[PDB]
């Protein structure tokens, strides 16, 4: 029996609503990679970098940055929420690294609407289990992508 | 003819002197349907005493008609004036003999036919009304003179012993039990019919049979016959002692007031009839293993398991007919591979994989499906196991283009 946390929505659904409103396909980046190389899943390590790097260059990742501003009633509230978001994601990144959390896909990442905090759910893979699996072993301590790092502040991370 | 019914239900003045006489002339009409319709509306009019006396004084001839005419004629025995007229040419004695041998049991058929037409969608070649047909024993007990004949013949003892000792094994002797229950119920429909019926203590026997009976049809039959017993005030008192209630008002007034009765009776607790004793269910009383670790080609680099000399098309004729023994390691490993795919096809878990495996064998080795013994083994397995229709049609179809020369050679020799 898991408690229900109010005023929070998952990151995957948050981006989906923004893109569909702006007449933007949900998987533009995925389509470009398949168009350039249909056998993306079978490419070698060096070849996947070329396809992956090409996709992120032809599409500008700022959906989360603009999303947090359009939902702010004023500029004073916008700055307060952004500050909380930046220093709440950093806490879970280091704590999650020690615990060894894995499988941090966007569906398991929730952002608080009223305060801008970051909440993590589904603590299933711990103690580096996901890194040692033979099926798609992820090799990243935590989730820090271009979408998140473009919303904390303009100067970077 | 159909318009004489509305003049009957509207209580037209003096209908019993000019209306009844018009239904006797119409009874001899040329068309059967018109004559049959006249009997239907005439039986309804006979329920009034004034109308019934009119027919007796006219003494019509109803013997030439069918069973409808015979039943209408039997109602004359309920009146002492009509009983003397009939019991003067030697008629009641003939009916008693005929009502014990020939169609005593056919009265049950008349009961069942009306119910089956009412609500079954059977139609033997909107709420209807099903009224109890006229019965000889139920009309002879209205007057004491008629009741005397029923007792001297000693028919009550014959019927009562059939109820206390029922044989619920043969479907023909069960109908005799029904032929007795419906006969006992009509006798108890009158006060003078209950005096000679309760002296042998038969009513509790029916009550026991109405709640503890192996055959459920007999259990439901007793409910109807217990209604006929409750047609009198005296009869309802007997049932009340045994925790059976009944309605104590007639149908002439549709708003009864608690201070002739219609036949209806139900137990105080309805669950006393719906109890049935439980009866236990009757069901309560190799190459396959080695194949999964190897391949068909790897192993290559008697086979029939359930093959005995009683369930084979060719092997069974060695002794009875006189056939010759069949003739033939490469081919013995193909029988097991074919057989094991048949068993795995009985689960339908992976039909495509198993069907693909059998098609390849028929292409690479088309001659393996040409032995009668293998077909007998497959046919035997199709009986014990269960297969889906598309899968069952897939088997027995790879064997369409076969010759079976062994059977042809042997059959020709023994026949010639």
């Amino acid at each position: 029996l898991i408690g229900w946390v109010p005023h929070c929505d998952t990151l995957h659904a948050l981006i989906r609503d923004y893109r569909e409103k702006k007449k933007i396909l949900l998987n533009i980046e995925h389509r470009i990679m398949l168009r350039m190389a249909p056998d993306y899943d079978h490419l070698t390590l060096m070849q996947k970098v070329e396809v992956f790097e090409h996709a992120v260059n032809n599409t500008a990742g700022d959906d989360l940055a603009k999303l947090l501003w359009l939902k702010s009633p004023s500029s004073e509230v916008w700055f307060d929420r952004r500050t909380n978001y930046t220093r709440s994601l950093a806490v879970m990144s280091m704590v999650g690294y020690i615990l060894g959390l894995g499988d941090r896909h966007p569906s398991n990442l929730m952002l608080d609407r009223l305060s801008g905090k970051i909440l993590h759910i589904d603590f299933g893979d711990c103690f580096e289990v996901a890194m040692t699996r033979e099926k798609f072993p992820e090799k990243i301590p935590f989730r820090l992508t271009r979408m998140l790092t473009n919303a904390m502040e303009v100067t970077g991370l | 003819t159909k318009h004489l019914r509305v003049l009957l239900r509207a209580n037209v003045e003096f209908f019993n002197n000019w209306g009844i006489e018009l239904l006797v002339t119409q009874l001899h009409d040329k068309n059967k349907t018109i004559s049959s319709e006249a009997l239907d509306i005439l039986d309804e009019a006979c329920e009034d005493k004034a109308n019934l006396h009119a027919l007796i004084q006219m003494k019509p001839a109803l013997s030439h008609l069918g069973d409808k005419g015979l039943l209408l004629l039997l109602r004359f025995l309920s009146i002492p004036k009509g009983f003397s007229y009939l019991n003067e040419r030697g008629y009641v004695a003939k009916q008693l003999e005929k009502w014990h041998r020939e169609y005593n049991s056919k009265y049950v058929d008349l009961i069942e036919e009306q119910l089956n037409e009412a609500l079954t969608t059977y139609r033997k070649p909107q709420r209807p009304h099903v009224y109890l047909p006229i019965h000889l024993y139920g009309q002879l007990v209205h007057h004491k003179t008629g009741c005397h004949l029923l007792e001297v013949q000693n028919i009550i003892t014959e019927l009562c012993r059939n109820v206390r000792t029922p044989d619920l094994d043969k479907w023909e002797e069960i109908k005799k039990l029904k032929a007795s229950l419906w006969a006992l119920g009509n006798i108890g429909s009158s006060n003078w019919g209950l005096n000679l019926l309760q002296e042998e203590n038969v009513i509790p026997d029916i009550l026991k049979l109405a709640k503890q009976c192996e055959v459920l049809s007999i259990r439901g039959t007793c409910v109807y016959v217990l209604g006929l017993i409750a047609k009198t005030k005296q009869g309802c008192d007997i049932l009340k002692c045994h925790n059976w209630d009944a309605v104590r008002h007639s149908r002439k007034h549709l708003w009864p007031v608690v201070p002739d009765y219609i036949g209806l009776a139900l137990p105080v607790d309805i669950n006393d009839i719906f109890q049935v004793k439980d009866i236990p269910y009757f069901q309560t009383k190799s190459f396959h293993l080695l194949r999964q670790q190897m391949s068909l080609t790897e192993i290559m680099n008697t086979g029939l398991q359930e093959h005995t000399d009683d369930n084979c098309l060719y092997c069974v004729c060695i002794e009875i007919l006189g056939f010759q023994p069949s003739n033939q390691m490469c081919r013995i490993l193909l029988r097991k591979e074919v057989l094991r795919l048949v068993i795995n096809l009985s689960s339908s878990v992976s039909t495509k994989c198993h069907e693909t495996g059998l098609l390849t064998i028929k292409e690479k080795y088309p001659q393996t499906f040409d032995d009668i013994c293998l077909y007998s083994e497959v046919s035997h397995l199709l009986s014990h196991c269960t297969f889906r229709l598309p899968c069952r049609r897939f088997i027995q179809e790879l064997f369409q283009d076969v010759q079976f020369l062994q059977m042809h050679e042997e059959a020709e020799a023994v026949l010639a």
């Binding site: 229900w4 | 190799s286 009985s346 689960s347 878990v349 014990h384």
Partner: protein, 210 residues
């Protein structure tokens, strides 16, 4: 109270006996509290997974073991608890409804598995899987349609409480006045997902919905 009920419901005999011994001691000073917790715990777990939910997971797991691992003794032990609950009789309309639609197939398939334990013929076990797989296909076609549940249909004992002395789960501190369960909403919504979680809304003693 909550951890003890979980321990008392464990499969292990040692944990089961030890947990019950502690429970009966608490019955002296507070008997009505443990009785309510046992009723609530049994009903909540019943709502979480229904009879057709258990069989869908059980048959899918059993099929993988038999056809992937080729283990026969391990397949039966998976399905033994599933057939065990059907012998105790349905306690609600939903369980009664399941026992009519798929009751005959599941009970007959058990009989064929019983003959394999004695005869040992492979055909008996294969014929048993003809009924298990047929029911599995039927259940899999109605799982997506399940989108809402009525308390009367699944567990009538939950909406007839109207009052409880048991605290709301997940909120209890000795330094704060306690809040108890007042009522349970008569309808709960099922979230469309692979696990299909339910949305249970309680009612606190102070008028705050949890």
């Amino acid at each position: 109270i909550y951890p003890l009920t979980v321990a008392s419901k464990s499969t292990t005999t040692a944990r089961h006996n030890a947990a019950n011994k502690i429970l009966k001691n608490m019955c002296e000073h507070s008997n009505t509290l443990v009785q309510q917790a046992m009723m609530v715990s049994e009903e909540l777990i019943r709502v979480a997974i229904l009879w057709h939910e258990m069989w869908h997971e059980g048959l899918e797991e059993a099929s993988r073991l038999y056809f992937g691992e080729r283990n026969v003794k391990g397949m039966f032990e998976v399905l033994e608890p599933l057939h065990a609950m059907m012998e105790r009789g349905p306690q609600t309309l939903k369980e009664t409804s399941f026992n009519q639609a798929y009751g005959r197939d599941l009970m007959e398939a058990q009989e064929w598995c019983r003959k394999y334990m004695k005869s040992g013929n492979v055909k008996d076990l294969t014929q048993a899987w003809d009924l298990y797989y047929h029911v599995f296909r039927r259940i899999s076609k109605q799982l997506p349609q399940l989108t809402s549940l009525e308390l009367q249909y699944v567990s009538p004992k939950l909406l007839m409480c109207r009052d409880l002395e048991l605290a709301v789960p997940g909120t209890y501190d000795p330094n704060q006045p306690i809040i108890r369960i007042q009522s349970i909403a008569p309808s709960l919504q099922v979230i469309t997902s692979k696990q299909r979680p339910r949305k249970l809304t309680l009612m606190g003693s102070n008028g705050h919905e949890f």
